Amino acid sequence: VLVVPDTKPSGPQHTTKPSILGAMEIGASSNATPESTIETRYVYNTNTNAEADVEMFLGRSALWGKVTLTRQYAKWEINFQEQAHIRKKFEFFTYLRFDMEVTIVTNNKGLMQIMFVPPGIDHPETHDDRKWDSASNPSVFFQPKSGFPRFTIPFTGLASAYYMFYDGYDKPKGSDNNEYGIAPTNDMGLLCFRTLDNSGGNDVKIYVKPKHITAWVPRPPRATQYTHKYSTNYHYKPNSSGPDEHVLKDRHFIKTRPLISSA
Amino acid sequence: VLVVPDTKPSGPQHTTKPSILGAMEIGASSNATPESTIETRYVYNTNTNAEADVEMFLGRSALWGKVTLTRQYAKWEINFQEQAHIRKKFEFFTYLRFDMEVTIVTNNKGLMQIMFVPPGIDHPETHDDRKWDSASNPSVFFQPKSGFPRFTIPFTGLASAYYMFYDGYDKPKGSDNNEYGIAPTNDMGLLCFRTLDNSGGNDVKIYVKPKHITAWVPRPPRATQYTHKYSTNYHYKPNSSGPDEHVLKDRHFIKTRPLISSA
Amino acid sequence: GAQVIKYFNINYYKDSASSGLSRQDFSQDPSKFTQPLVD
Amino acid sequence: GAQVIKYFNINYYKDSASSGLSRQDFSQDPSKFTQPLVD
Amino acid sequence: DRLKQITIGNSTITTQDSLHTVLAYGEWPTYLSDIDATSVDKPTHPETSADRFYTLDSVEWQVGSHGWWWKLPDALKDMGVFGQNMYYHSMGRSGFIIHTQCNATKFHSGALIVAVIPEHQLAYVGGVKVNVGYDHTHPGQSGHQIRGPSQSNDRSGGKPDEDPLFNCNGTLLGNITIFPHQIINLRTNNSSTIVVPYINCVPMDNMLKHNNLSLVIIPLVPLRPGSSGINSVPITVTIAPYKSEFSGAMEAQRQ
Amino acid sequence: DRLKQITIGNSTITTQDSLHTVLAYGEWPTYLSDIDATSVDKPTHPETSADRFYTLDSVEWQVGSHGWWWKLPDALKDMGVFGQNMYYHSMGRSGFIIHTQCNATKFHSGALIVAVIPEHQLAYVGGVKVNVGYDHTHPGQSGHQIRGPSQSNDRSGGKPDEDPLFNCNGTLLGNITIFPHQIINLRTNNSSTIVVPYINCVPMDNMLKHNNLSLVIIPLVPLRPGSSGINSVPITVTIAPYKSEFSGAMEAQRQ
């Protein structure tokens, strides 16, 4: 683990090269520490940032999705776009390469099957669908009482990382069905759920933990509530009803103050 | 693990022995790589086929059979003939030698007995049948809640491999009861099921995983939906009802296109 | 237990059939196909 | 099992993806940021 | 000294009032190595003919102008033989030397944020779920004048967001300093230079469909004339591709 | 054997009925060395994207057809990124691999002279002193169907000479063997290959104004069907630039 540096002693200084002057324009952050500004003592400083590294920061297994079994059947397309709090944390970065371990928290009872359906094929659309009988589609059978199912999905990119943001399109110029952003760039599969009993509740919570993460290009954190998934659209249409039609709210987190200089 | 070869560099070439010419008639595939055709760069290629080897390809534990407990009793004759998706994957090969681990997924509750009945003897035909009391017939007692039963059956051939396809008969020329194909060639036993309680549902799913596989003579993959088991018959009779009597459908997976050269 | 900057291949049930998948792979060549010729 | 006044880093499922968090950390420097200059 | 000269073959920038050059992520553009490669065909390196400064049209910076953005490689698609190589190849990569130029006078006040955003995915100008159109995110050399936030901005045709405070993507300006950037403060410098390598999780991709970078010039503090009758100043952008590669020669993807 | 394969990057010729390749003047195309250079700027080498086979339109060879010619670099001016590099540069050089293709049948008879003429300066179609027009000596990939000698050939507009016996320049066909050439005799071979280096007394010149080479296909003996109903056969020409250079990047000389 890496501890933060110690504070070194510093005395009075008369210097013709100010360290406290600079240029904000150059594009560089300040190198100034308290030894440049005040007169300091030696402090032996054992603090660590270990809990701020991208493995610990993104490694807590957030809830990605919720589904309800309707007629003892549910379906979920794997993605982080649906939940704002985990979507904001992934979007501090442009590119992420991670394995994910998927824990399924269900309040149902009896017996459940999860099918991981790899991209490019058809999933079971109901319980009792013949497609639940699969040679090569990986599935998980579990009894929700006595344990939570968990499996790891490795990194399935088509690229060396996942795009969190994608400034391109999947089709050429004149195509009218063009799709913008990361949705065409990869698909992580879908999870199909069914119950082989009736028993308990219908709620299925999918918790996902990124592990073995490599993050690439830091971005400004999301300053606005999300509106749609796979968008970046931050303009929110609160109501379709009437004269407030076509009125949009940004919904940011900036708060005002009565006066500068009085705070 | 074996990685695929690297792409080597290649420049412009003037050669009086074309590598791109050949004869389709000789019965051999092309040796051509992109270094023979285009001008190439060195690519360092770490990709593996590990997921395509016959152990991984056939090693996923497909569903072989489903049975329903009728009066807390079920019976299943072990075979892969019933399920089209796993039957197609085994039939890429003429001969297979494998051990199989058998997992039983049941939605029943209480207490179940599985009896493995080796070939050549009589099985229990009902629950409470005295034949459920056996000295030497291997059985499994399990409670479906808290765990799925699993056991391994080793390779029982009578031969060095299983026949996936058999072009012979079990009886001589003039015998009228002749049976064609692999059904006489081996019998893997049958699984008898009974419940010692009432409790849960009646459905019993038998999942089988081939392991320690050796495959022999590659065959063309099945191009047509199956009709009967132990047959290879692909002609499907959809209805016995009326004037459509004796009309057969092949049910293949070939799809047409409007034009060649326009695709 | 059955057999053996490390690794341990351990058989819990002491049978060769009871083991998991066989991951040790050597034998291969496409040439039985794609080039099945005398000369 | 997979690999190794002690410590033991043991992989139960024999896959590199199936391991827990990667706690071994070397690569770092803020200077890609905060000082992204030629000279 | 503040003097600088950057010569990319056939063309020379000379900046006499200048900061240090920003080298994005401390990384110079390189050619794609063999370790990282995907496609098997030998790529083309145009070098001096593609790699050279292409100056775009100037934009008039005024009181009340909210900003501008350009997409790359897009802005260069019609520029010289670099833009020709985009249409005749499947894939391509490149780094860029972006040189932004605004000079006024010691009586003028103002500040500009000049930033380069990797994968700058815009937001729709407002309302329902609509992908921003290919037509709007590919203006070419002209870039996009940012207009501004309004309820009256036309929401037709999948138009991009006009609000520079949210970076048009929904994240605050003022955090844009996490990307390679410089400020042009008229008091201090009249120009900026950013050398960005090729940034992507892919070795090469289609130059036309995907915009790797985005050059965004935001007037952080407005333009004050002081005592002069000059209420507007031009802003010229000059881009040099550097270490540009192309592979997968085909018919031009043009019309 | 008669088999041949020529791979110039991205493209491959395969000729199964073939002669030796003519290497013009025993000289392979090279890049311009430093000893022979004139201009001081670093040239561009497009390599695999410009250097590759460009097949032109086929010409129908018939009873009574007098021949065809193509001008080089001209024929390639619209072809791929090679033709793009012609318009964006002052100067350029290149060698060429010309592959001519005519196949008929063992019942067909005929012979073609396939020659490459350096500096093939045409003659005006007749009469007074008129330079042949730029428009006529630059047909592009289409080349020029030689028509034939007539008093009725239109003398308007500075048209070139139509008579193949005099090589359109006033020198006898049949001495055309002093240039790099092969004959396609349908009895013998269905194709031809000539590798010409860059020939000029100048290190590089303008690709558009000056035509270095000329490819001339003359039906030395007419096309006899034998007993078949096939009275015409196509003739396809495929050109690979090789070791092509360009220098003096500028605006495209196009319109």
Swiss-Prot record, chains A, B:
It is found in: Virion; Host cytoplasm. Interacts with capsid protein VP0, and capsid protein VP3 to form heterotrimeric protomers. Five protomers subsequently associate to form pentamers which serve as building blocks for the capsid. Interacts with capsid protein VP2, capsid protein VP3 and capsid protein VP4 following cleavage of capsid protein VP0. Interacts (via C-terminus) with capsid protein VP4 (via C-terminus). Interacts with host CDHR3 (via N-terminus); this interaction occurs near each threefold vertex of the capsid and allows the virus attachment and entry into the host cell. Forms an icosahedral capsid of pseudo T=3 symmetry with capsid proteins VP2 and VP3. The capsid is 300 Angstroms in diameter, composed of 60 copies of each capsid protein and enclosing the viral positive strand RNA genome. Capsid protein VP1 mainly forms the vertices of the capsid. The VP1 C-termini form 60 dominant spike-like protrusions on the surface of the virion. Capsid protein VP1 interacts with host cell receptor CDHR3 to provide virion attachment to target host cells. This attachment induces virion internalization. Tyrosine kinases are probably involved in the entry process. This is Capsid protein VP1. It comes from Human rhinovirus C (strain C15). The chain holds residues 584 to 846 of 2153 of the full protein.
From Swiss-Prot, chains C, D:
Myristoylation is required during RNA encapsidation and formation of the mature virus particle. It comes from the Viruses. It is found in: Virion. A lipid is attached at residue 1 (N-myristoyl glycine). Coiled coil: none annotated. Interacts (via C-terminus) with capsid protein VP1 (via C-terminus). Interacts with capsid protein VP3. Lies on the inner surface of the capsid shell. After binding to the host receptor, the capsid undergoes conformational changes. Capsid protein VP4 is released, Capsid protein VP1 N-terminus is externalized, and together, they shape a pore in the host membrane through which the viral genome is translocated into the host cell cytoplasm. This is Capsid protein VP4. It comes from Human rhinovirus C (strain C15) (HRV-C15). The chain holds residues 2 to 59 of 2153 of the full protein.
From Swiss-Prot, chains E, F:
This is Capsid protein VP2. It comes from Human rhinovirus C (strain C15). Forms an icosahedral capsid of pseudo T=3 symmetry with capsid proteins VP2 and VP3. The capsid is 300 Angstroms in diameter, composed of 60 copies of each capsid protein and enclosing the viral positive strand RNA genome. Interacts with capsid protein VP1 and capsid protein VP3 in the mature capsid. Interacts with host CDHR3 (via N-terminus); this interaction occurs near each threefold vertex of the capsid and allows the virus attachment and entry into the host cell. Residues 136-163 are annotated as: Disordered. The lineage of its organism: Viruses, Riboviria, Orthornavirae, Pisuviricota, Pisoniviricetes. Residues 139-155 have a biased composition (Polar residues). It is found in: Virion; Host cytoplasm.
